[PDB]
Every structure is written in structure tokens, then in C-alpha cells.
Amino acid sequence: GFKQDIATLRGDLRTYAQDIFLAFLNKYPDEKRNFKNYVGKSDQELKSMAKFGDHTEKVFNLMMEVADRATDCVPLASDASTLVQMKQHSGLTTGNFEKLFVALVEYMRASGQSFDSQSWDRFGKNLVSALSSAGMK
Ligand code: HEM
Ligand SMILES: CC(c1ccc(O)cc1)c1ccc(O)cc1
């Protein structure tokens, strides 16, 4: 289920963090407007870039903490407000997050593995609802 999925993802975190972000960027190429240093690069080139590895892993480390602190796939309001108020998230709207979780769920469905994709799909919708309540446009 969802809890075990958090353990599975954490057990190969750098790999999953990079592969899910690439799935997102490749499914939604327009989302690179937010990541101009990643333009004009193949996946293997991005996986050679120090900030792409560093940043993807720090993002996913916090994503897994947000998921782990959730009840029934509903994140804490404190975690939603941290994600809205972060200076690095000044430009974003909830649609950026919806798209990320669509790509994450698709990734999991396409994997060989028994991820609980329906729990991740809920988590993404509930995180979007929480971000909207905490003031993200
Ligand atoms: C639950 C999902 C997310 C979490 C937990 C999260 C977390 C973080 C964290 C911890 C950082 C700091 C990274 C560092 O400085 O090394 C960061 C930066 C950033 N995040 Fe988020 N983020 C999420 C979703 C998103 C989404 C959906 C977008 C845009 C589509 C986004 C855009 C950014 C940008 C532009 C930065 C700063 C620039 C950069 O680090 O390359 N984030 N995020
Ligand atoms: C959107 C986010 C991310 C999405 C999915 C992941 O598995 C890891 C990270 C992100 C933020 C800043 C970056 O520099 C790189 C990526």
C-alpha cells in the first residue's frame, strides 16, 4: 500500500527521484519554463548535472516526508503551507502539482511493480486541494 510504497521509493531514492522528474518533464515539456537550466539536454545529460541530481533528491526527500506524515493520503496543513510559502515556489500554481502527480502515477502504472497507484493519485489530488486551501492559485 501507500506506506510500503514510501519505503520502496526511499530504498532507491536518487533513481526514483530523477526518473519520476524526467517522466514529468518529458510528458509536460512546457513545464521546463520553470527549469531553464534543464533546456536542451537529454535525460543522460541531465543525470550528469550536479544541481539536477542534488535538487531532484532534496525535492523527493521532502515529498516522501509529506506523504509519510499524511493520514489517508491527506497531507498535513503545515506541510501544504510550507510548500505554498517556499520562495522557490513563488511562480507556481496548483496545475504544476497536478501535472507532477499525473506523471508520477503513470510512472508507477508503467513500472513492473506493485505500487498502490490509486493511493498516489488520491495523494496528488488531496495535496492539490491542500495547496489551494493554503493559498496557492
Ligand atoms: C510535493 C511536491 C514538491 C516538493 C516536496 C518540492 C520541494 C522542493 C524543495 C525541497 C526544493 C528545494 C531544492 C533545493 O534547493 O535543492 C524545491 C525547489 C523548487 N521547486 Fe519544488 N517541490 C515540489 C513540487 C514542485 C513542482 C510541481 C514544481 C514545478 C513544476 C516545483 C518547482 C520548484 C522550483 C522551480 C524550485 C527551485 C529551483 C530548483 O530547485 O531547481 N516544485 N522544491
Ligand atoms: C519538480 C521537482 C521534482 C519533481 C519530481 C521528482 O521526482 C523530483 C523533483 C524539481 C524541482 C527542482 C529541480 O531542480 C528539479 C526537480
Q: Which of 64, 65, 45 minimizes the C-alpha distance to 53?
A: 45
CA 112 to ligand 2 centroid distance, Å? 23
Report the first-to-last Cα separation within the chain, whole angstroms. Answer: 31
DSSP string of 42-68? -HHHHTT-HHHHHHHHHHHHHHHHHHH
Method: X-ray
b/e per residue 47-76 (b: at least 16 CB within 10 A)? beeeebeebbbeebeebbebbeebeebebe
Tell me, what DSSP letter sits at residue 36?
G
Q: How far apart are CA 136 and CA 128, in angstroms?
A: 9
Q: How far apart are CA 9 and CA 137, in angstroms?
A: 29
The helix or strand, by DSSP H or E, that contains position 79, with its residue range, turns out to be helix 77-85
Q: How far apart are CA 93 and CA 134, in angstroms?
A: 12
| Total domains, the chain | 1
Name every protein residue with a CB atom under 6 angstroms from any ligand 2 atom: 17, 20-21, 24, 35, 55-56, 59-60, 100
Name the residue of 9, 21, 99, 102 to mutate for ligand 2: max ligand atoms within 8 A of Cβ.
Answer: 21
Q: What is the resolution of this structure in A?
A: 1.5
Cβ atoms of 106 and 27 closer than 8 Å? yes
CA distances (Å), origin 11, targets 7, 37, 64, 105: 6, 28, 11, 18
Range of the domain at 48: 1-137
The residue whose CA is least distant from atom 24 of ligand 1 is 97
